[PDB]
């Protein structure tokens, strides 16, 4: 049911974007299907984590009937507007990475985003929550462009590949969006906000980014591009991944000079130099013990989190089951 | 005392938003120069017309003291968040016509837009009318993305080149953030908006903006570079002008064609023969009394709008004289 529930409200939010346009733009046939398409496209796909994150925090929040209905429709609503956010970013990377293609690739990203604003004033126009998640939601998205700041300049202004500033680009640029956003918004619709230590919530959030980032880092570089979905290519961009950060605490001053000379470059046989440094470094050893101190620093914190809001834990828990 | 007010506000706004960054965000020195010089680069520079307008509408609306005070400096804020939606504008055209400079201006381009929404959360965070102020600067946005649309695929889908299509672009893409939204905030900011004709409010917008419009295409290809301040583009660029939409309405079947085989090309003896085709069907000479019509309509609806609204009609006027 929550998959087919938010499937459906995805054709009632799209027919009330695309019939806006039509009576209230003066948008044309062509332009409308056009945009049908392209709204399908960016938005459809994915798994939706995001998304059904917000059903499961809204229906632990009623369980544990005009409200009911209302606030499910909600959960499906603000969903979408974190799935179209997802859209937006994705199309502005692909930007990143008189030609009409690049013009209406920036526009489809100026419109996704947008569409997540149009779509909240219209279903959520006579709710007094309206201001406080317009602000939230807000207040994430800056965060994230923040974060792809960090991220995309980390190694320029290798000293800032650090543990602590490695978790300052997962924090920005991944964790506010993906983890704390949705369990945020399924709060907001519950009007459950003020009844959550919010303190041990974005704890939980910044800690589950971490522990996804942290594995997504170890299989981009070792896991092949048939079984990863992508081909891996954090080597060649130099990014600063987890396996970067902890390479070079424990390398010797001729591996780091290896390291130095061989990280960033599309060179095949510079980017098997870094793997095989990663390798003889023990760094998928070092993998299983840092990613299971998360999980123990997540396990404990979901029970605090559940001493004064136990239905709340129990869809935190859900969400880490998903990332775990 | 509007420009000093307004450059005092700016360094207000931007001392704040670097401050936030650096506080709450965990932001480096290195980066917050960074984005310091990049906010100078992209919001100062220009003439401050739609920024001016929120100004010259609020003291319009308290003259004809705590609470002065305040609506000027709202009217200064919400001319700043004009002023950087037009700089994320200007940014994502740049780009539109692993590269660091590239991420880094797509980066750019949304810290701007964010940067909007942080200063209004912030000035106006107590203010009653943050949510309409933040619903309608949005919808704005939404519509100018809509425009940009139109104007990029115009050429595409010389059907769409008529006198009706330019209006619907210029409404879309100029006109509801350059003359409507300025108006708009400025009513906002002095709790005057239910004491105005909306109607004839947008109308007199649409107008204003369709006159700046067909000036600024007659003068990208009649007006030399060093007295324009740019390279005229349009004929090469294919735009759907009102010359070229003017010229189609007047021409013979072998001067259309003429016109066909000739516009859109790079090519300098092509836009040579497009400026020959415009110059021997009089449209310098149509443009003249295109222009008087439109500036008839203009003065007429100020009138009607003075009737209920004597203040407001005033402060419309002062922004019709900086375009006629």
Same mark, same amino acid.
């Given at each position: 049911?929550?998959?087919?529930?938010?499937?459906?409200?995805?054709?009632?939010?799209?027919?009330?974007?695309?019939?806006?346009?039509?009576?209230?733009?003066?948008?044309?046939?062509?332009?409308?299907?056009?945009?049908?398409?392209?709204? &399908?496209?960016?938005?459809?796909?994915?798994?939706?984590?995001?998304?059904?994150?917000?059903? /499961?925090? +809204? @229906?632990?929040? #009623? =369980?544990?009937?005009?409200?009911?209905?209302?606030?499910?429709?909600?959960?499906?609503?603000?969903?979408?507007?974190?799935?179209?956010?997802?859209?937006?970013y994705?199309?502005?990377d692909?930007?990143?990475?008189?030609?009409?293609?690049?013009?209406?690739?920036?526009?489809?990203?100026?419109?996704?985003?947008?569409?997540?604003?149009?779509?909240?004033?219209?279903?959520?126009?006579?709710?007094?929550?309206?201001?406080?998640?317009?602000?939230?939601?807000?207040?994430? &998205?800056?965060t994230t462009a923040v974060g792809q700041l960090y991220d995309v300049?980390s190694?320029? /202004?290798? +000293? @800032?590949?650090? #543990? =602590?500033?490695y978790k300052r680009i997962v924090k920005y640029k991944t964790a506010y969006y993906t983890?704390?956003?949705?369990?945020?918004?399924?709060?907001?619709?519950?009007?459950?906000?003020?009844?959550?230590?919010?303190?041990?919530?974005?704890?939980?959030?910044?800690?589950?980014g971490?522990?996804?980032q942290?594995?997504?880092?170890?299989?981009?570089?070792?896991?092949?591009?048939?079984?990863?979905?992508?081909?891996?290519?954090?080597?060649?961009?130099?990014k600063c991944?987890?396996?970067?950060?902890?390479?070079?605490?424990?390398?010797?001053?001729?591996?780091?000079?290896?390291?130095?000379?061989?990280?960033? =470059?599309?060179?095949?046989?510079?980017?098997?130099?870094?793997?095989?440094?990663?390798?003889?470094?023990?760094?998928?050893?070092?993998?299983?013990?840092?990613?299971?101190?998360?999980?123990?620093?997540?396990?404990?914190?979901?029970?605090?989190?559940?001493?004064?809001?136990?239905?709340?834990?129990?869809?935190?828990?859900?969400?880490?089951?998903?990332?775990?």
């Amino acid at each position: 049911m929550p998959m087919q529930m938010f499937m459906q409200v995805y054709d009632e939010i799209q027919m009330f974007l695309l019939e806006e346009l039509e009576l209230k733009f003066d948008m044309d046939p062509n332009r409308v299907r056009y945009l049908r398409k392209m709204m &399908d496209t960016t938005c459809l796909g994915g798994k939706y984590n995001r998304g059904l994150t917000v059903i /499961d925090v +809204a @229906e632990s929040l #009623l =369980s544990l009937g005009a409200r009911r209905k209302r606030v499910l429709h909600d959960a499906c609503v603000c969903g979408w507007m974190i799935e179209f956010l997802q859209a937006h970013y994705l199309v502005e990377d692909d930007i990143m990475d008189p030609d009409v293609t690049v013009q209406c690739a920036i526009n489809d990203g100026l419109l996704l985003k947008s569409w997540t604003h149009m779509m909240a004033m219209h279903f959520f126009a006579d709710r007094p929550f309206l201001q406080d998640l317009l602000c939230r939601f807000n207040r994430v &998205d800056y965060t994230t462009a923040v974060g792809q700041l960090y991220d995309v300049t980390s190694m320029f /202004d290798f +000293a @800032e590949f650090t #543990l =602590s500033n490695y978790k300052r680009i997962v924090k920005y640029k991944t964790a506010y969006y993906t983890y704390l956003l949705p369990l945020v918004m399924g709060l907001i619709v519950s009007e459950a906000l003020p009844t959550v230590d919010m303190g041990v919530t974005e704890e939980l959030a910044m800690l589950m980014g971490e522990y996804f980032q942290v594995q997504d880092d170890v299989m981009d570089c070792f896991t092949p591009p048939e079984r990863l979905g992508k081909v891996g290519t954090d080597i060649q961009d130099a990014k600063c991944s987890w396996l970067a950060v902890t390479f070079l605490a424990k390398a010797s001053s001729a591996q780091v000079a290896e390291f130095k000379a061989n990280y960033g =470059s599309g060179d095949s046989e510079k980017v098997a130099t870094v793997r095989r440094l990663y390798e003889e470094a023990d760094l998928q050893g070092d993998y299983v013990a840092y990613e299971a101190a998360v999980a123990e620093q997540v396990k404990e914190l979901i029970e605090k989190l559940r001493l004064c809001s136990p239905g709340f834990a129990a869809s935190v828990e859900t969400l880490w089951g998903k990332t775990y």
